[PDB]
Amino acid sequence: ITAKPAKTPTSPKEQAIGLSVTFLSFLLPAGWVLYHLDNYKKS
Amino acid sequence: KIKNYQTAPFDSRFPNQNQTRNCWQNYLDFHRCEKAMTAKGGDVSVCEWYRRVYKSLCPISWVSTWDDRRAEGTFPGKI
Amino acid sequence: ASGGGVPTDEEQATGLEREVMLAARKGQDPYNILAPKATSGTKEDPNLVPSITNKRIVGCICEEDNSTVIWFWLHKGEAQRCPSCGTHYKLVPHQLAH
Amino acid sequence: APDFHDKYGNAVLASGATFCVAVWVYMATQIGIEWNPSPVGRVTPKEWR
Amino acid sequence: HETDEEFDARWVTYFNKPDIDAWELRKGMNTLVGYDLVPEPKIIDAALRACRRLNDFASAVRILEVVKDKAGPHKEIYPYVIQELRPTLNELGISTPEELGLDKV
Amino acid sequence: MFINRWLFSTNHKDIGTLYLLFGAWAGMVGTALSLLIRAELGQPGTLLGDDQIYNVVVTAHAFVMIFFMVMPIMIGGFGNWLVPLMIGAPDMAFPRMNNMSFWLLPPSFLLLLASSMVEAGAGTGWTVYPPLAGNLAHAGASVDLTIFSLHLAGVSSILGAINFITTIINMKPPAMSQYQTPLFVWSVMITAVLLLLSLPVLAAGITMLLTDRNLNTTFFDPAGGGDPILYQHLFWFFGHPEVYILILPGFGMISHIVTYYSGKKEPFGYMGMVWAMMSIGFLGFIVWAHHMFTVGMDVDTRAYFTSATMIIAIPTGVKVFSWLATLHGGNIKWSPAMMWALGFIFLFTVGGLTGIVLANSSLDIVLHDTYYVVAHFHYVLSMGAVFAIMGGFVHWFPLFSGYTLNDTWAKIHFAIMFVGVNMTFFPQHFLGLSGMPRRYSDYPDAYTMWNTISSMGSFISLTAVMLMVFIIWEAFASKREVLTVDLTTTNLEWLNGCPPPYHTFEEPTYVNLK
Amino acid sequence: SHYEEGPGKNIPFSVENKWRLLAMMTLFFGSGFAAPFFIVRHQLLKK
Amino acid sequence: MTHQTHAYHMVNPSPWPLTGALSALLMTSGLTMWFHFNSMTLLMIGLTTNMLTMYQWWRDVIRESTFQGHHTPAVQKGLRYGMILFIISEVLFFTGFFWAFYHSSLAPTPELGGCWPPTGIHPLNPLEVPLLNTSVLLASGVSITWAHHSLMEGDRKHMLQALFITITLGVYFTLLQASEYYEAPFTISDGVYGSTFFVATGFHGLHVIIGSTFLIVCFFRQLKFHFTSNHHFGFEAGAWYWHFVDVVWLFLYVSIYWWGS
Amino acid sequence: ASAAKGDHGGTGARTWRFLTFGLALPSVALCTLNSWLHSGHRERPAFIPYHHLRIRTKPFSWGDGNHTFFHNPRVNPLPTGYEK
Amino acid sequence: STALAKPQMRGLLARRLRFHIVGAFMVSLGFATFYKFAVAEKRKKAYADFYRNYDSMKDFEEMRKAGIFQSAK
Amino acid sequence: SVVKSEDYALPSYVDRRDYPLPDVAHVKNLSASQKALKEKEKASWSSLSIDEKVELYRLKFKESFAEMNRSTNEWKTVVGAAMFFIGFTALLLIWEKHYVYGPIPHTFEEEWVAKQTKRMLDMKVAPIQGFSAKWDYDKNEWKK
Amino acid sequence: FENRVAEKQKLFQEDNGLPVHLKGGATDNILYRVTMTLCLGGTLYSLYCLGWASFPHK
Amino acid sequence: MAYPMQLGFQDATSPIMEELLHFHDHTLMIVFLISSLVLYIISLMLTTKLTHTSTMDAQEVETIWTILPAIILILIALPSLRILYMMDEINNPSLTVKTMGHQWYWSYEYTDYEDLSFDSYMIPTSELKPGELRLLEVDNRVVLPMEMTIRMLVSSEDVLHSWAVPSLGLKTDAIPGRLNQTTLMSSRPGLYYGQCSEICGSNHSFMPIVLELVPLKYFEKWSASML
Ligand code: HEA
Ligand code: HEA
Ligand SMILES: [O-][O-]
Ligand SMILES: [Cu+2]
Numbered sequence A: 001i002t003a004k005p006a007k008t009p010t011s012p013k014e015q016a017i018g019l020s021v022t023f024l025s026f027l028l029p030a031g032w033v034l035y036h037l038d039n040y041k042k043s
Numbered sequence B: 001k002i003k004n005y006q007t008a009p010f011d012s013r014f015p016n017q018n019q020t021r022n023c024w025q026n027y028l029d030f031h032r033c034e035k036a037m038t039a040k041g042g043d044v045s046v047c048e049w050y051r052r053v054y055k056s057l058c059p060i061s062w063v064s065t066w067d068d069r070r071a072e073g074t075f076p077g078k079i
Numbered sequence C: 001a002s003g004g005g006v007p008t009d010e011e012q013a014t015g016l017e018r019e020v021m022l023a024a025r026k027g028q029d030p031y032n033i034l035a036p037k038a039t040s041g042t043k044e045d046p047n048l049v050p051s052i053t054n055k056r057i058v059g060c061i062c063e064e065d066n067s068t069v070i071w072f073w074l075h076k077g078e079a080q081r082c083p084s085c086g087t088h089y090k091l092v093p094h095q096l097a098h
Numbered sequence D: 001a002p003d004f005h006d007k008y009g010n011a012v013l014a015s016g017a018t019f020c021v022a023v024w025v026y027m028a029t030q031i032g033i034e035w036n037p038s039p040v041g042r043v044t045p046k047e048w049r
Numbered sequence E: 001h002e003t004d005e006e007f008d009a010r011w012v013t014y015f016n017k018p019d020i021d022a023w024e025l026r027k028g029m030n031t032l033v034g035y036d037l038v039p040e041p042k043i044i045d046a047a048l049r050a051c052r053r054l055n056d057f058a059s060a061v062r063i064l065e066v067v068k069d070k071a072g073p074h075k076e077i078y079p080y081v082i083q084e085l086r087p088t089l090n091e092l093g094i095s096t097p098e099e100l101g102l103d104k105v
Numbered sequence F: 001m002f003i004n005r006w007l008f009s010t011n012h013k014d015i016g017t018l019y020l021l022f023g024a025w026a027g028m029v030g031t032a033l034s035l036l037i038r039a040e041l042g043q044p045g046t047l048l049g050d051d052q053i054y055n056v057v058v059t060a061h062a063f064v065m066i067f068f069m070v071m072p073i074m075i076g077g078f079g080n081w082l083v084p085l086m087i088g089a090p091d092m093a094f095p096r097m098n099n100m101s102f103w104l105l106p107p108s109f110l111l112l113l114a115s116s117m118v119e120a121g122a123g124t125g126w127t128v129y130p131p132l133a134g135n136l137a138h139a140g141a142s143v144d145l146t147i148f149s150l151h152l153a154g155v156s157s158i159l160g161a162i163n164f165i166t167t168i169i170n171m172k173p174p175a176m177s178q179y180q181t182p183l184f185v186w187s188v189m190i191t192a193v194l195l196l197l198s199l200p201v202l203a204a205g206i207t208m209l210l211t212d213r214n215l216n217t218t219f220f221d222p223a224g225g226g227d228p229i230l231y232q233h234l235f236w237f238f239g240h241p242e243v244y245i246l247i248l249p250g251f252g253m254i255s256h257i258v259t260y261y262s263g264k265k266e267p268f269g270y271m272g273m274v275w276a277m278m279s280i281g282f283l284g285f286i287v288w289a290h291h292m293f294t295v296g297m298d299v300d301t302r303a304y305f306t307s308a309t310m311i312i313a314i315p316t317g318v319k320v321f322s323w324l325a326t327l328h329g330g331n332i333k334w335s336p337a338m339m340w341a342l343g344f345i346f347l348f349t350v351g352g353l354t355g356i357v358l359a360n361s362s363l364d365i366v367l368h369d370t371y372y373v374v375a376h377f378h379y380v381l382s383m384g385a386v387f388a389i390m391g392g393f394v395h396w397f398p399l400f401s402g403y404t405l406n407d408t409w410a411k412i413h414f415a416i417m418f419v420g421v422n423m424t425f426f427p428q429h430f431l432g433l434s435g436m437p438r439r440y441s442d443y444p445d446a447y448t449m450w451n452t453i454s455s456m457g458s459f460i461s462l463t464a465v466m467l468m469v470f471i472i473w474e475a476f477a478s479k480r481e482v483l484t485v486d487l488t489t490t491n492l493e494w495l496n497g498c499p500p501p502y503h504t505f506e507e508p509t510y511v512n513l514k
Numbered sequence G: 001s002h003y004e005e006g007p008g009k010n011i012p013f014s015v016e017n018k019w020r021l022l023a024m025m026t027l028f029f030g031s032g033f034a035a036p037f038f039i040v041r042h043q044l045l046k047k
Numbered sequence H: 001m002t003h004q005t006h007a008y009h010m011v012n013p014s015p016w017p018l019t020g021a022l023s024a025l026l027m028t029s030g031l032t033m034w035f036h037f038n039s040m041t042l043l044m045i046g047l048t049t050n051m052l053t054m055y056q057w058w059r060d061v062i063r064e065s066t067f068q069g070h071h072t073p074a075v076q077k078g079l080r081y082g083m084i085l086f087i088i089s090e091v092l093f094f095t096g097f098f099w100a101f102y103h104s105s106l107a108p109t110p111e112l113g114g115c116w117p118p119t120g121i122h123p124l125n126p127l128e129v130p131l132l133n134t135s136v137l138l139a140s141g142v143s144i145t146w147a148h149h150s151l152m153e154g155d156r157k158h159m160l161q162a163l164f165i166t167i168t169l170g171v172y173f174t175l176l177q178a179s180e181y182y183e184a185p186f187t188i189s190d191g192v193y194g195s196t197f198f199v200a201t202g203f204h205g206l207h208v209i210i211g212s213t214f215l216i217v218c219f220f221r222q223l224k225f226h227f228t229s230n231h232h233f234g235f236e237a238g239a240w241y242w243h244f245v246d247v248v249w250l251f252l253y254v255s256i257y258w259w260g261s
Numbered sequence I: 001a002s003a004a005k006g007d008h009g010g011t012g013a014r015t016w017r018f019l020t021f022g023l024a025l026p027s028v029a030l031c032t033l034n035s036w037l038h039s040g041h042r043e044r045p046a047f048i049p050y051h052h053l054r055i056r057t058k059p060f061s062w063g064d065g066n067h068t069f070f071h072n073p074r075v076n077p078l079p080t081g082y083e084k
Numbered sequence J: 001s002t003a004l005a006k007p008q009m010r011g012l013l014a015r016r017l018r019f020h021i022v023g024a025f026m027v028s029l030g031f032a033t034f035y036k037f038a039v040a041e042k043r044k045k046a047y048a049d050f051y052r053n054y055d056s057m058k059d060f061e062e063m064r065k066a067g068i069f070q071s072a073k
Numbered sequence K: 001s002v003v004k005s006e007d008y009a010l011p012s013y014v015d016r017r018d019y020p021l022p023d024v025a026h027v028k029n030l031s032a033s034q035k036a037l038k039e040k041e042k043a044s045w046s047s048l049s050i051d052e053k054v055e056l057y058r059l060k061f062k063e064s065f066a067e068m069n070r071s072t073n074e075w076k077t078v079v080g081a082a083m084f085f086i087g088f089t090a091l092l093l094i095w096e097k098h099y100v101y102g103p104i105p106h107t108f109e110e111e112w113v114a115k116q117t118k119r120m121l122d123m124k125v126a127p128i129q130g131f132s133a134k135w136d137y138d139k140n141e142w143k144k
Numbered sequence L: 001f002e003n004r005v006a007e008k009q010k011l012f013q014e015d016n017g018l019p020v021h022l023k024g025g026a027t028d029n030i031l032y033r034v035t036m037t038l039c040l041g042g043t044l045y046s047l048y049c050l051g052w053a054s055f056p057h058k
Numbered sequence M: 001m002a003y004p005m006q007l008g009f010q011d012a013t014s015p016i017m018e019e020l021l022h023f024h025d026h027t028l029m030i031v032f033l034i035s036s037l038v039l040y041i042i043s044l045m046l047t048t049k050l051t052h053t054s055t056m057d058a059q060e061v062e063t064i065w066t067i068l069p070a071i072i073l074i075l076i077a078l079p080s081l082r083i084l085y086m087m088d089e090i091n092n093p094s095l096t097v098k099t100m101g102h103q104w105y106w107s108y109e110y111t112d113y114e115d116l117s118f119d120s121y122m123i124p125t126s127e128l129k130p131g132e133l134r135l136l137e138v139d140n141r142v143v144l145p146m147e148m149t150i151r152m153l154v155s156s157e158d159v160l161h162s163w164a165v166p167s168l169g170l171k172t173d174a175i176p177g178r179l180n181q182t183t184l185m186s187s188r189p190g191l192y193y194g195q196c197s198e199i200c201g202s203n204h205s206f207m208p209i210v211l212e213l214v215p216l217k218y219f220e221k222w223s224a225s226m227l
């Protein structure tokens, strides 16, 4: 709706870092397990 | 009449998809008829119809276990 | 054959339960258990809205069978009107003086 | 006054659109994905024995 | 509702109340804006006059902005309304939003 | 301080926040599971291994999304936050018990996670039908850990239901009749009645499944005279009501959202809407066997269950058309929340119509257990329940937090997710008509294209949910506090500011007895 | 009442530093998303 | 001075919900440990923490109402609803078990002999102990009503006396039922007839025990004058729960003991 | 049967005390009498190894895992017949 | 000048609705009747045409000779 | 003038087409010159200069209708960013294909699908509309 | 017996800033701590068991 | 069977499947109608600056939007019920065959005259002969005479299974202790595939059904060669 200006504004750069860290926290752990899938299946 | 046929015909007593009792009833009726005819010195061939029908409808495993049980004395149905 | 022995509310009720009980027999309602009866709502006979502070939310059911209540804060001061029907409401103080 | 969209909107729209189409076309045809489309009109039936 | 004529009349009277306060001026316009219609010139006229009595120039200009907005896509409505209101716009010295340049960006 | 507030809470707002946090976390677990599913099916062959490890994944996906994401969020979250604010109540009727409803959830989830770790997990399907779920085909602790998880979740929702009904009925301003409470409050009262009557039958059914597995009973074992079909009746007597329990609070939020963003004071046909929700609730209790059309029931009872299942479209239709009538003539504000609501209206309609096809027992013979049913339910759940949750979230987020979201990002989020979920489930209609079964870890070669397109769509949704996490971060990171809110006269929950104080309505609202 | 009130005070986690928040949010949602993948791995590593 | 102007109860932050929830985790995983890995330790810990949580939670509720006076009429009304809604869910719980019984007894499968009761099962005579149990429970519905009236009329001695009779009758039913369980020629493992009989009556029996202790709690609260002639919801709830337990038995008796045998 | 005891089966602590001691309790006594002149005792049923009885899909989590919770040696046979 | 004539000022939304509601029915019955003829009718014909000059024996033979059956070489 | 969070219970200013006359004036605090303009307003409006009229309007309201119904180029950023992220998704797929996915069944090679289509055509798979109905049995070519 | 609820009312209404579950005295505190301890300990034991069973145990 | 990029149902091999295809076109036409109607109204509601935000009357149009859907449901229900009832008149079969589901294969029994019984397993993908269908080929097909009304009885010896053949319009669950009956009736010779349609454990995706329909005379000699 209507609001005050950001008390601690997140610049483009900060957002880029924020988005990056977010995606990575999701993709790295899963990629690791999936990457070694066959490595687990062969016993 | 014919003790030779095609397959167990439609039985209005069991008109729905669940045919469990059709197999069961005909299986009982047979052994009940088999007893009387084989006991009162009668004709066991009258009982043929039921055996054909129950043979057609009943899974082999059911007929086998029920037979094993009638021999064992543990057949739950009343014959 | 009765011998009594069980307390009555008048003799054993305590805290808020006792408070609403006593206040009830004196004809008052400090705990908003009852629905307030409306006055004519004109500039001269406003609905008197009690409050223990300087503002209270008023819900105005403009017409008898309305499904939406009109809500708004009534502040200490001049009679304010419902945004939808103009009915008047004026704040007044509660039993406990602020 | 001019906003983020007035300035970058056009760039964002175009480069984003372009990037999308390229990576998808590449993925859909350059790596080994088997789409297994209908053989009708595509495959010449070969005797199986 | 009531006959169109009675509706118009009821509104002309509302705004013609000599001791109408700002609350009633606002409430009247804000309520009229929710109907499926662009108010008749005679209703706008009265609202415009009530603005004069309340010494509110700005509200008179915003009332004209609202009449154009309610017309939506029907662009022949506003000019016709501005036309019938001209005698009144001139008398009270009310400038149209276009004259003030408020139809800008 | 932190303990007294967060672990020993007796405050409706804090408990509601706890639920939203729990549900958000469960949603990530559920999302990962949904991707393991599509990863397995995105290429012919096998990725994980057999249908056991696969179905353990398919089963947990269902329980997590239904019991740990959709219900905690819609009912415990939005329910506890908004219900009291909307009726001017100081808190819920049983604030301490309410706190127990929440705390039963983490233990319940643990038991579900534990079931997939011991032995080979529960690969029974979310329906956990015996004999596959019995102590022979699934020997070991898994299924039992699963049953216990469902017991705690049921107790949780039942206690919560008692709380919501008592509150909504006993704690309104004395002058306010039930026909003066907003639609969302009605939506949660009815849902609560459904949970109250349906969860106990599930509890009885799975308790019987538990005794068959450990106490040598034979409720579902033919050997002792039991009947596996009996389980189906009991599970689905709860199971159909459960899907209406999952969509009703969403029907409520959509009414508020559509009304608010069209600039209206009230939704069109308020009483038609109350009537519609009661009807859907009532009718959803007498149609359960529409999930057992290939089980061998008599033809007459199948004719009844298809007829009865179909009339539920009439009351549902009046709700779809009333939402459209509300938009009519509105001053539309194209906010993210409004985008989520318009997508719900259309997508839910597609998913519901696809449900009418399946209502036909004759036609369900060939559609049952195929991916055509997977498509129907994902349209109503992934693009129905979930879309209401997202709309409700971006709309009310400022009230819960006091900070605003970046609206441009929120719209980018909607766009991506809209593409992802449609790409994922639309093609599954084809797979189903063409015969691809459900619960298969691999499929005949012909079904490759559609499954490939579908798995790709699920990756797009993945991007959408990762983005969503960023969006919540940036709001809390930037800290734009709220100033003014529009339409507060007909939206009480916003009258105490953003966020409302710990204790709201210490002094009740004043409502005249006109 | 005795509890703090207002923006950023009605939540069980601190929001007074966007970077520590990024980290806490990363662990929170990250751990949830990671769990199934590690359960599948654990099931594959038993036999 | 100057605080809340509504009649509702804002409860102090309590740790009982947390311990009660943890108790539930302990009892279920403890039951999982007993059933498979043959150990009762976890289940014992769990049962102990559950009793401790219920004792303290309900103790606090007495403190808040009797001692602190928070149960204004608005609050009592909510409690009535809560209790009524609770009984309804219990009724549906029992409905799942009656459904199962009726489903099994009306379509006896071939493996049972195609008849009910199954061949090999010798049912109890409904005219013996089950008739007794029936009269003991109905009698206690009469004595509890006398207790209630005594209370409302302010008669402490009679309320206490009637409450006592009610309780012994409940205990009497419990003992008689325990005897029947032991004398019974069939067991829970005797197929669907045994399954259906022992879990449906076992749950009811568990409910009779829960109601008896609830009444016992009311008995002691009465000895300590907690109840007034007009404010005694704990006894009303105890009384409603008791009639529900009575009604469920009538259905059991008619269904399982009479018709189903 | 039916029922009809004149009047007064509602309202008054005295009326309910009257019904408690004049109807309720005396019934409990008669049924207690009846249950005595019937329930002297039952001779145990013959053991037939029916497969739909004495079910054992998983051993009971107590004792030797073959005895039901309220096992009465005198009337409950194990899957292999009576214990004595 | 020229006096502009008085235009229509009331019920402009309702007026817009009455029109399109018809066009809404047109467009939707179009898609339906289109499905009927381009698809439904085409299929009734496809089945009717196929089974008219159909010989199950001729079909079986062609299949038998191609080596597909395992009970009829 | 400058709104504050804590003023939630007080009337607020808002610009919206369906509530043209807000409950509060945009500007509550007048300067010497403004107090004077407000005084000239009590006289004939014919005497106010256009600049004085505009100033009077900008004291009562924040934005004109024309300013509030203004269209943005926001959609460009939304569609562009959406496509960018959808594009970013294809990279996860490319990664998946390369490091997670193994080789597909041998039944997908050209030889097999060609034999298999023949066998399908031999068993008359979907002869009424779907597969074989699109094959010309007489010319041993796909119908066209 | 004797009617003593009035003394109790006094003990519990005493503005001592204690929550109702501790307002009764010093035994409330020991009960409370015993309860919390068995729950936390039992919960830890529980997690351990889950950890044990999750591995193939021969 | 299914072919690549298929959109609709498998071609109909029997008369009820044909009936279902047409009933589905009927139903699909109506869902296209309703869904396109809702989409038009929605776009119509969102494309005008004209407003009317005050209250509107509820009752008036509600009758149209209650009564219309009711008529449309009767239009879907009549055909539906007719076909449903048409599926149950088994009425005088000339052959009865049983099939028993098992943990990971189907077994068939033709027992009218003899005691013919055999197991039917999926042909592993590595043992497929060129041109054979990956997860669809079975080693021992279920031979049945074409153009004859056959009564199939479905059941199971372990967990639930479901016996299905899309092209013939059949799907009957296989439940232990129960005998479910369905009517099979092919109007063409050929091979017709199906798959287990009820989750049953580790190899649920790998236990197909293949029907071989040949003329009577070839069915008879086959029975005899199978013992
Ligand atoms: C919240 C989710 C949700 C909702 C709301 C519904 C809604 C409906 N579902 Fe669905 N359904 C599921 C979730 C849901 N379902 C799930 C999870 C399953 C699978 C369970 C499993 O097996 O695992 C399932 C499966 C399922 C089956 C089982 C099929 C099978 O297994 O073979 C059936 C059967 O009839 C069915 C029917 C319907 C119908 C008729 C509706 C109706 O309520 C829809 C009504 C809606 C509309 C009709 C659209 C709007 C109305 C109009 C615009 C009016 C005009 C319309 C007409 C005149 C036609 N559903
Ligand atoms: C609410 C329920 C729900 C939801 C939302 C989903 C969402 C998803 N499901 Fe579904 N699914 C089921 C319930 C659900 N599912 C059920 C009942 C089954 C049947 C199980 C069985 O057969 O036993 C099933 C089965 C199932 C199958 C069939 C498996 C098989 O038969 O072999 C497939 C196939 O792709 C699938 C995929 C997906 C995908 C890609 C998503 C994706 O759309 C997920 C994308 C992510 C989201 C849409 C949610 C993100 C939202 C949040 C994270 C909330 C955050 C909130 C706040 C911050 C406040 N699921
Ligand atoms: O279940 O729809
Ligand atoms: Cu359903």
Ligand SMILES: [Cu+2]
Residues within 6 Å of the ligand: M101, M102, M104, M160, M161, M162, M196, M197, M198, M199, M200, M204, M207
């Ligand atoms: Cu199977």
Ligand SMILES: [Cu+2]
Residues within 6 Å of the ligand: M161, M162, M196, M197, M198, M199, M200, M201, M203, M204, M205
């Ligand atoms: Cu299967």
Ligand SMILES: [Mg+2]
Residues within 6 Å of the ligand: F368, F369, M162, M197, M198
């Ligand atoms: Mg199924």
Ligand code: NA
Residues within 6 Å of the ligand: F040, F041, F042, F043, F044, F045, F046, F047, F441, F442, F443
């Ligand atoms: Na796969």
Ligand SMILES: [Zn+2]
Residues within 6 Å of the ligand: C060, C061, C062, C070, C082, C083, C084, C085, C086, C087
């Ligand atoms: Zn009003």
